[PDB]
Amino acid sequence: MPCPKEDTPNSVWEPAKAKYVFRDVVQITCLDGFEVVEGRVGATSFYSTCQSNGKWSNSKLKCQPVDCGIPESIENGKVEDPESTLFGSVIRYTCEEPYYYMENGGGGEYHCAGNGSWVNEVLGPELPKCVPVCGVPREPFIGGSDADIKNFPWQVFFDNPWAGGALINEYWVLTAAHVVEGNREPTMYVGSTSVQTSRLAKSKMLTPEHVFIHPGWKLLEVPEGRTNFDNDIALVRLKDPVKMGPTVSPICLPGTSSDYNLMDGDLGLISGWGRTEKRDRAVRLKAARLPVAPLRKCKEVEAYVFTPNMICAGGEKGMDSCKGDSGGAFAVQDPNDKTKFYAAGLVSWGPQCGTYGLYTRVKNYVDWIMKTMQENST
């Protein structure tokens, strides 16, 4: 005749009574995190009625923990294999270190919340973004020596003709305008210490979506006898993002602040496969270390123009800027972080090279760089 109230963890009954009787109707609500799964629904409340036989109409319907389900994956990241996916469970996202780090990480710890979704203390249900770590080479680096591609993972090799550039994120290569005014659809390659024309299908090719030449770059009908190198800078947007790894990763950009100004004597690394192309053998990457020198030098050899948008480097006899690929990066150690490199300069001055080098002063172009990258996103 009367209906007993059985064990009620996981739920609350309105009205809550000690002893229920025939015809009594009870509303049952599951506690947050709990549901009754029947058919296509996870019911969080329902009615049950006390029958003439003392059994409840919906006895045996039980509130169970919600399942947040198998965690979504992220690009350039992994999620540790979870012990359960039920209410209150904890998962941990991490990025592929050291080539990637978590962008404003909530720490990557998510928990299975009451409504069935994985949530993070700060991000709510948004997943972590894993973005490329810039500037830090796996293995760091007279007239110049032998290099490995690991010393300069940001080096982009251009091919027709031989030239260079620097990878600055997963979608963008930084290079000299002189290098691209000719080929608007440049062939680019990354990830190898050696280059061999017959052998290029083995080294990972980048495909250009579009080339952005700095508007201050004076265009010439006759490019071979260019006297003015002001604003020698350009951006190439790639179709596909670049996977980072021990042989490929971007280089940092300079800040706008004055500690990214250069003093005479400041050391920079240049790198490349050389000015003279070789079609019959393999050529290994080479590098050289050069001191910043005052611009008032860089005048021996009618007649070149010089602006504060240019950096001069070198000076002693055996120094060689040819080493030294066009459009490549003049790499200086970061002032706030001795462990990462940034592109202070891009290799300028066309064919002119040796003993002293000329470099586009990257710092004066940071605004234009960020603007282009943000206004040509996706």
UniProtKB/Swiss-Prot annotation:
Domain of life: Eukaryota
A GO molecular function held by the record: identical protein binding
Keyword Iron in annotation: no
Subcellular location: Secreted; Cell surface
Protein keywords: Calcium, Complement pathway, Disease variant, Disulfide bond, EGF-like domain, Ehlers-Danlos syndrome, Glycoprotein, Hydrolase, Hydroxylation, Immunity, Innate immunity, Metal-binding, Protease, Repeat, Secreted, Serine protease, Signal, Sushi
Active site residues per record: H178 (charge relay system), D232 (charge relay system), S326 (charge relay system)
Glycosylation-annotated residues: N115
GO cellular component terms, semicolon-separated: blood microparticle; extracellular region; extracellular space
Domain Sushi positions: 1-65, 66-132
Protein EC: 3.4.21.42
Disulphide-bridged cysteine pairs: C3-C50, C30-C63, C68-C112, C95-C130, C134-C252, C298-C312, C322-C353
Keyword Calcium: yes
Activity control summary: Cleaved and activated by C1R. Immunoglobulin-binding promotes autoactivation of C1R, which results in the cleavage of the Arg-Ile bond in the catalytic domain. Inhibited by C1 inhibitor (SERPING1).
Domain Peptidase S1: start-end pairs: 142-374
Chief place of localization: secreted
PTM: Cleaved and activated by C1R to generate Complement C1s subcomponent heavy and light chains. The iron and 2-oxoglutarate dependent 3-hydroxylation of aspartate and asparagine is (R) stereospecific within EGF domains.
Gene Ontology BP term (one): proteolysis
Task of the protein: Component of the complement C1 complex, a multiprotein complex that initiates the classical pathway of the complement system, a cascade of proteins that leads to phagocytosis and breakdown of pathogens and signaling that strengthens the adaptive immune system. C1S is activated following association of the C1 complex with immunoglobulins (IgG or IgM) complexed with antigens to form antigen-antibody complexes on the surface of pathogens. C1S is cleaved and activated by C1R to generate C1s subcomponent heavy and light chains.
Family: Belongs to the peptidase S1 family.
Subunit organization: Core component of the complement C1 complex, a calcium-dependent complex composed of 1 molecule of the C1Q subcomplex, 2 molecules of C1R and 2 molecules of C1S. The C1Q subcomplex is composed 18 subunits: 3 chains of C1QA, C1QB, and C1QC trimerize to form 6 collagen-like triple helices connected to six globular ligand-recognition modules.
Implicated disorder: Complement component C1s deficiency: A rare defect resulting in C1 deficiency and impaired activation of the complement classical pathway. C1 deficiency generally leads to severe immune complex disease with features of systemic lupus erythematosus and glomerulonephritis.
Protein name per UniProt: Complement C1s subcomponent
Record organism: Homo sapiens (Human)
Location of this fragment in the whole protein: 292 to 684 of 688
